[PDB]
């Protein structure tokens, strides 16, 4: 009821920049934009009161855009889709390292 | 308990492995480069009421 009207984002997390491997892509997630946390004034621990604090990154997952969109629309959430950025494969040659500079100008 | 080398230096180097493995999430660590450049904890908390005393 109260938590069924929240706005979410459907997206595919991109590849990290610290690793060259590509094995965590193709997954689709529903971001619940849970950004209400504070510090407990006893130990400094991070407290929250939002039930969807980590379910969107720990449990809820979708193999495709269509599945996530269908789930969001069945639950009634307002969703916006962010298309993922993909690399463009370009012709690369090891011979290019030794290209002739041409006649001196 | 947290231990030291015989020199008095702490053994812990804030690798955060214990925090990762802890089945009860009872360990909380913060760390930073110490003034002499050492990798050391600024905060190392164990909630004795969350801990299951598993030894992991």
């Amino acid at each position: 009821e109260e938590h069924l009207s929240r706005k979410v984002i459907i997206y595919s997390p991109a590849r990290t920049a610290t690793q060259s491997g590509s094995g965590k892509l193709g997954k689709w997630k529903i971001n619940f934009v849970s950004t209400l946390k504070w510090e407990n004034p006893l130990m400094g621990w991070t407290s929250t009161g939002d039930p969807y604090a980590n379910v969107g990154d720990s449990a809820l997952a979708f193999d495709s855009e269509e599945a996530a969109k269908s789930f969001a629309e069945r639950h009634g959430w307002d969703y916006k889709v962010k298309k993922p950025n993909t690399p463009l494969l370009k012709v690369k040659s090891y011979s290019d390292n030794f290209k002739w500079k041409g006649n001196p100008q | 308990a947290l231990r030291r080398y015989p020199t008095g230096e702490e053994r812990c180097i804030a690798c955060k492995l214990c925090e990762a493995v802890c089945p009860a999430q009872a360990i909380t660590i913060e760390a930073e480069e110490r003034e002499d450049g050492s990798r050391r904890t600024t905060r190392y908390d164990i909630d004795m009421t969350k801990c299951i005393y598993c030894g992991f």
């Binding site: 809820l60 997952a61 979708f62 193999d63 495709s64 599945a67 789930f71 | -």
Partner: protein
């Protein structure tokens, strides 16, 4: 009564429209059926002389949010008569 005999005999004897999928594996023999035939399939397996699946070990659900029928209901059964186990599964949705 080994899992090769159960697979072959069930293929030969069960009404065809009851089973959509049959898996033979060391992880367990598995029959998938539509929801409308689950009851009759289980009654057959319990009563038939060559199966005698008398013990229902458990029923459990599994959630698959990416599926139109998100729930899968798993029936784990045992034949003490033939010392064999069978798994029967069907899918379901929220309503």
């Amino acid at each position: 009564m080994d899992n090769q005999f159960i697979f072959k005999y069930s293929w030969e004897t069960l009404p065809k429209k009851w089973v959509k999928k049959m898996e033979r594996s060391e992880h367990g023999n598995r029959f998938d059926t539509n929801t409308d035939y689950l009851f009759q399939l289980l009654c057959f397996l319990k009563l038939h002389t060559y199966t005698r699946v008398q013990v229902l070990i458990d029923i459990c659900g599994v959630d698959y949010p990416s599926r139109k029928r998100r729930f899968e209901v798993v029936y784990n059964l045992l034949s003490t008569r033939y010392n064999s186990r069978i798994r029967v599964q069907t899918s379901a949705d929220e309503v």
